[PDB]
Amino acid sequence: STMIGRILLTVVVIFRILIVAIVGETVYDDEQTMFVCNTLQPGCNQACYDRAFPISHIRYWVFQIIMVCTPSLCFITYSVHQSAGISRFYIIQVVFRNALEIGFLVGQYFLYGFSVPGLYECNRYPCIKEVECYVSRPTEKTVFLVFMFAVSGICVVLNLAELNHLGWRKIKL
Amino acid sequence: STMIGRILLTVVVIFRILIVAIVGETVYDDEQTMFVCNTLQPGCNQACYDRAFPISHIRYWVFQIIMVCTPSLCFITYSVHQSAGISRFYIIQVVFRNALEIGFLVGQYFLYGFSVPGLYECNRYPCIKEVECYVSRPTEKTVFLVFMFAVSGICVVLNLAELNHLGWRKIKL
Amino acid sequence: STMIGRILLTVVVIFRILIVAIVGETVYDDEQTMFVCNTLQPGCNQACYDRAFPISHIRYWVFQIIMVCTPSLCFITYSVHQSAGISRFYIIQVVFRNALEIGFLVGQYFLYGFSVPGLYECNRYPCIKEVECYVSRPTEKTVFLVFMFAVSGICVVLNLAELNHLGWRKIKL
Amino acid sequence: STMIGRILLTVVVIFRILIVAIVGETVYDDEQTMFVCNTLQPGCNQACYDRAFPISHIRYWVFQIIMVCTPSLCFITYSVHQSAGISRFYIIQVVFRNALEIGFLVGQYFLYGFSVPGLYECNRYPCIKEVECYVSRPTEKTVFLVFMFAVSGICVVLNLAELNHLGWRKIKL
Amino acid sequence: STMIGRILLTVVVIFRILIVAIVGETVYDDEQTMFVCNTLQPGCNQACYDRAFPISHIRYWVFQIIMVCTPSLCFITYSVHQSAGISRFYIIQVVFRNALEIGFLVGQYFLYGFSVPGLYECNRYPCIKEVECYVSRPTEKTVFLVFMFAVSGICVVLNLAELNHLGWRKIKL
Amino acid sequence: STMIGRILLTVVVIFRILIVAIVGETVYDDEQTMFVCNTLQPGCNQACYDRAFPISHIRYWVFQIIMVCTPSLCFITYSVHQSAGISRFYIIQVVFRNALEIGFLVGQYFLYGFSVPGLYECNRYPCIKEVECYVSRPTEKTVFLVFMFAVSGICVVLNLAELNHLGWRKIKL
Numbered sequence A, B, C, D, E, F: 001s002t003m004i005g006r007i008l009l010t011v012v013v014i015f016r017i018l019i020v021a022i023v024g025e026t027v028y029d030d031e032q033t034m035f036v037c038n039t040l041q042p043g044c045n046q047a048c049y050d051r052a053f054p055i056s057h058i059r060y061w062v063f064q065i066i067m068v069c070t071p072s073l074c075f076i077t078y079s080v081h082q083s084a085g086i087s088r089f090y091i092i093q094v095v096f097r098n099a100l101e102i103g104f105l106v107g108q109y110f111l112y113g114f115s116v117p118g119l120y121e122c123n124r125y126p127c128i129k130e131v132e133c134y135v136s137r138p139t140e141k142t143v144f145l146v147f148m149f150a151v152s153g154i155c156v157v158l159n160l161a162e163l164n165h166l167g168w169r170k171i172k173l
């Protein structure tokens, strides 16, 4: 069943790209404009927001998508160069895709967790002692995070199935 | 009369996609900017808005459109792969489309109801006791909700007619 | 003279589509941010704006354009399906186009009238008794309304001429 | 010298379209946001701005461009319809283009004049007695107005030269 | 060495167009929003900004680019008209391009100078006596100005080299 | 191994272009709007921001990308001109690309360093003595800076490998 696997993998990849490109930028538009802290100190909002969200989810997902698509670009460009052999590059391409997908999934888990809390406790200079800050659209961001995790997991499973179908002797050489 | 059914189904799908893509993003632009609560507590606006609208309508409809279109993409990609049999995949594609459409319609009803009230009563921390908040463009959003429900219902009816035409005997095999 | 009629109909349809798509969105961009009421009550602006303009003109016109273009799309897709008879679908398409155009024109008149006043008197909760609110760019919106009415009337007249050319005898059968 | 006339006319038309489409919308973006009146009365800004600028320049120019291009569209669509005679439609097209261009130029002069003053004196309700309001980017708007007038005048002269070349004898028949 | 000249000229023209189109509009986005004067008089900001920057740099550069490209458009359209002689049009086009480039460079120098100061002294009505105003991103605008001047100078030198290569006897005839 | 080098070089170039074009403009959107200084002096924010960030990172990277791509454009245009010899232009193109890449990398290091601090001490007129200002999203900008440096270094290494492969003897002649 190596064919249905490829069909599903292509469909899932396209689905993820479309969803991100269409909704992600709009969801995270006012992330910093609607972030508010209970204080009068100038500059506390900037510091607390930067501590709460070092990297936005949307940029991480864009980077992940491009990086995961890169090996296919390598293979296609190699094929173009060859004309005006290819049965070996394919195995290495598959292995690299598997490694990249797994690494990105693990990194997402270790960076963001599984939910976006509605409150944040911040104690960065210049804020005096510890202050409380309030996040914008926590529930939508939680839903987006869980959905992206599920899609990435499906992709990982399909890639592992493909790699197993090839056989580890192909991967060895 | 299986041909007029397909014609109407295609026309309705295109109509829904066009309407959403052209007007939806503009209707819901200032959903959070124009949401106001009668209070002085910092952070009450964020909490009350997040409780009132956990997920925006437009994002739900975009997700629904992509998911409903997915099975046709699966079928087209399978057909492409086959060349450089297909009479069985079509039945499963139809069944999956029917199930997805019905599920999305039911989910929309259970999530949003049939109207958007102009007032909201919010009792989420940090708001003190219970406060009153006011929504932006409730009437336009109600009209949009009802129109989308009607279009989805028409799609469901056409899909059921198609599935009935194919037949239960054929579906079983 | 059934040819010049078709030429003019196509030209006016394209003209209307272009004008709307190019200027309408920009005209109605700040409709709600520049709407102000003389009061101190929170939430009175939202209620009064929603009562004054239940549906924006631009969205009504977009819906009208798509709906009016739908029958031609149905005819085209039926023609595509036929290859890989058509002289009867054409009459029904013409009749449906006539009905839709007339209905949309009448609806526009009954919804918006012929002018956009510069003042509004609002007595919706939470506003206390009666308040006075001030509209943004009333004159430009009045000009746009009248222009759209005139274009739609021209389209209706051309469609009626076409339908008369076809003849009642043919329409009946 | 009927050929260089056509070459110059085409080049000028393209030049005008490009200039408008590229810069006009950006010039007039903050026309109402940066318009300020010296008063405390709510709603005086809206009334005074609407009285000072009933129709924005950019929208008038867009309408003019589309209307002037319409007759060529009529001719092209007629030519397409003819295949799957034309030496007479051309003369009427030229005459209509001349009339439209002259009318639009005269209308622009009678609507806007030749300059945009930096101050405005406004006595519209609800403003008390007479107030003073201040315009945004008067000099750039004056330059744009004069440039558009010059380009339209060049177009009118070229069209008149073409019409004279065709001849009154031919035009009458 | 008439070929490398043409190659470099084409490359430089494309480079200038790309740089402007990509960064210019973003650099000058908040030119008026971030312009502030030290006063309490309503309307002083508008007058002082209009006096300081009668025409934005970006619009001047867009106009220059279109005007400089115009003669090539004239030549191409003439060539198209000729088919369904040309060795004399080309020299006239070269001369016109040289004149336009030199004129635009001189005009830029006389209009803007070589730097954008960070302070402005403004004494325009309604400002009382003389006030001080502060500009936004003076350094980036200075860098952009110098870069555009250098690119235009390179273009002028290449055009002069081409014209000299053609020879004076040939331009006279 | 001169083919895999070219494959990797093309892939990394495309990757860098995509990442910049997609995320850079959004990261640096509110650079000046969210920059705040602890003072009451009008005009201190503008001066301090201009001193802290003379040129935005995104514009520098756009300029670098276009300049690095220029030599390939020159070579392609020369090839087009040649038809309707080339083995010597290629070496000079490679050398120029190497020089440009190295220069841009060194310039980036000397201009921006390796991190974006969260605080800035500013003593520019009109600010009184020293003031403290707070930056927006320092961590994301630091990550972007480091990532761009790494990608540029990889490109430099690949270019040096290519140049070494061609040979010093060949480069001399």
Ligand SMILES: C=C[C@H]1CN2CC[C@H]1C[C@H]2[C@H](O)c1ccnc2ccc(OC)cc12
Pocket (backbone or CB within 6 Å): A020, A021, A022, A024, A025, A058, A062, F022
């Ligand atoms: C369909 C979405 C629209 C929004 N952005 C501008 C117009 C349209 C294209 C998209 C962007 O160019 C873009 C192009 C390609 N890939 C993208 C991937 C992600 C993205 O934002 C997360 C924007 C992307």
Ligand SMILES: C=C[C@H]1CN2CC[C@H]1C[C@H]2[C@H](O)c1ccnc2ccc(OC)cc12
Pocket (backbone or CB within 6 Å): A022, B020, B021, B022, B024, B025, B058, B062
């Ligand atoms: C026609 C609408 C315009 C508004 N958005 C940017 C330019 C144009 C395209 C559209 C967006 O890229 C987009 C592309 C494709 N499908 C879409 C589907 C939905 C949507 O918003 C709900 C935006 C979509």
Ligand SMILES: C=C[C@H]1CN2CC[C@H]1C[C@H]2[C@H](O)c1ccnc2ccc(OC)cc12
Pocket (backbone or CB within 6 Å): B022, C020, C021, C022, C024, C025, C058, C062
């Ligand atoms: C020409 C207008 C521009 C403004 N909008 C984005 C870029 C360009 C396209 C248009 C929009 O995508 C769009 C596409 C197609 N039909 C439309 C119809 C109506 C509309 O606004 C009323 C926007 C439309």
Ligand SMILES: C=C[C@H]1CN2CC[C@H]1C[C@H]2[C@H](O)c1ccnc2ccc(OC)cc12
Pocket (backbone or CB within 6 Å): C022, D020, D021, D022, D024, D025, D058, D062
């Ligand atoms: C080149 C200009 C850009 C700005 N607008 C969106 C993207 C690009 C296209 C243009 C608009 O779609 C548009 C299309 C066609 N004709 C137009 C004519 C005028 C215009 O504004 C006055 C905008 C136009």
Ligand SMILES: C=C[C@H]1CN2CC[C@H]1C[C@H]2[C@H](O)c1ccnc2ccc(OC)cc12
Pocket (backbone or CB within 6 Å): D022, E020, E021, E022, E024, E025, E058, E062
């Ligand atoms: C690549 C730049 C993007 C920004 N603007 C909208 C989308 C893209 C196109 C460009 C504009 O339509 C445009 C088109 C063509 N020539 C232009 C020249 C100059 C310009 O701004 C100075 C904008 C231009």
Ligand SMILES: C=C[C@H]1CN2CC[C@H]1C[C@H]2[C@H](O)c1ccnc2ccc(OC)cc12
Pocket (backbone or CB within 6 Å): E022, F020, F021, F022, F024, F025, F058, F062
């Ligand atoms: C894919 C990104 C989207 C955002 N901008 C508008 C729509 C889409 C295109 C891009 C811009 O036109 C653009 C075109 C080409 N090269 C670019 C390079 C850089 C850039 O910003 C740093 C914007 C670029």
